[PDB]
């Protein structure tokens, strides 16, 4: 079946540098988008979404024309002390009444020092 894996538990980065938060899924099926969030609670912040919204400081590590891509690592540019926290890589299942959450990675601690 499929698992969403975040290998790095902690990572950090000086101000103005690029932090890499890596994520890899085992399989593409069930079909669904991969989203990155900061925090686990109800008021969590969407960090990256491929289809909609603009996330300027986020770049996809797997890069374009990566066919059948299963590497869902992200890169957050120009890091500030404000962007410190725990980031979760979550897999979603395609669903109407709005999509549904399926599996979430352990999480990667980001700091700033």
């Amino acid at each position, epitope marked *: *079946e*499929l698992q969403v894996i975040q290998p790095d538990k902690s990572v950090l980065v000086a101000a103005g540098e690029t932090a890499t938060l890596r994520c890899t899924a085992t*399989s*593409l*099926i*069930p*079909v669904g*988008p*991969i989203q990155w969030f900061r925090g686990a609670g109800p008021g969590r912040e969407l960090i990256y979404n*491929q*289809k*909609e919204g603009h996330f300027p400081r986020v770049t*996809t590590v*797997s*890069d*374009l*024309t*990566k*066919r*059948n*891509n299963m590497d*869902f690592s992200i890169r957050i540019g120009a890091i500030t002390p404000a962007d410190a926290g725990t980031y979760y890589c979550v897999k979603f*299942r*395609k669903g*109407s009444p709005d999509d549904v959450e399926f599996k979430s990675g352990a999480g990667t601690e980001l700091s700033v020092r």
Partner: antibody, heavy 120, light 109 residues
């Protein structure tokens, strides 16, 4: 190389049933979604259904009548069609799904198609 | 739910010239567009996915461009093989996949 070979298509009455099979080869059938797309005579392509790994999706005109099934032990994709309507007459294509980057699911390889004829 | 409209539904071009046709969508802003080529007695084959990415084994003449609602497929030098029907497919928003009406590239005489 990737090959998709359909079978089980023929002529049946309205309201009859028919089962289509598409045996996949040349790629890891277990790690990809598979799709059926039909094309009526003298008209364009229309998407029917899509299966992933227990998640199934159906077209609006098809929701209640058709069920997509796959068996990884046979590397085959199935589409059993029940309560067949006369308009459902089309050439049924089995296709393999592929994703670019983080956006997902266009059709890279298409089967040669099996002809189904719903008529009295 | 996102319907694709293809204009020049039929397009008459001379061999060796250039043919350009457009696909238009409602409610999709991104590049999740695919182009397909189908010959009369044959199954469709993928030419371009993600608007501008040309599939392997496809000649350089075929080229896709555009984003948002307007998209276009271009062939530099029309050959005998290129005369077929061409469909656009979006995978941006789908519980239901959707195909374009199709543009048939036709020989002009």
């Amino acid at each position: 190389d990737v090959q998709l070979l359909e079978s089980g298509g023929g002529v049946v009455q309205p309201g009859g049933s028919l089962r289509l099979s598409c045996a996949a080869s040349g790629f890891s059938f277990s790690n990809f979604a598979m799709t059926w797309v039909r094309q009526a005579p003298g008209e364009g392509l229309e998407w029917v259904s899509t299966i992933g790994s227990g998640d199934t999706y159906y077209a609006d005109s098809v929701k209640g009548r058709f069920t997509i099934s796959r068996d990884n032990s046979k590397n085959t994709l199935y589409l059993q069609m029940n309560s067949l309507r006369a308009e459902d007459t089309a050439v049924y294509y089995c296709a393999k799904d592929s994703t670019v980057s983080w956006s997902g699911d266009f059709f890279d390889y298409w089967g040669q198609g099996t002809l189904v004829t719903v008529s009295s | 739910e996102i319907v694709l409209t293809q204009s020049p539904a039929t397009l008459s071009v001379s061999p060796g010239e250039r043919a350009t046709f457009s696909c238009r969508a409602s409610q999709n802003v991104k590049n999740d567009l695919a182009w397909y080529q189908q010959r009369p007695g044959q199954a469709p084959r993928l030419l371009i996915y993600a608007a501008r990415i040309r599939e392997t084994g496809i000649p350089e003449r075929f080229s896709g461009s555009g984003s948002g609602t307007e998209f276009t497929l271009t062939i530099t030098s029309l050959q005998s093989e290129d005369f077929a029907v061409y469909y656009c497919q979006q995978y941006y928003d789908w519980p239901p996949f959707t195909f374009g009406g199709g543009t048939k590239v036709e020989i002009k005489r």
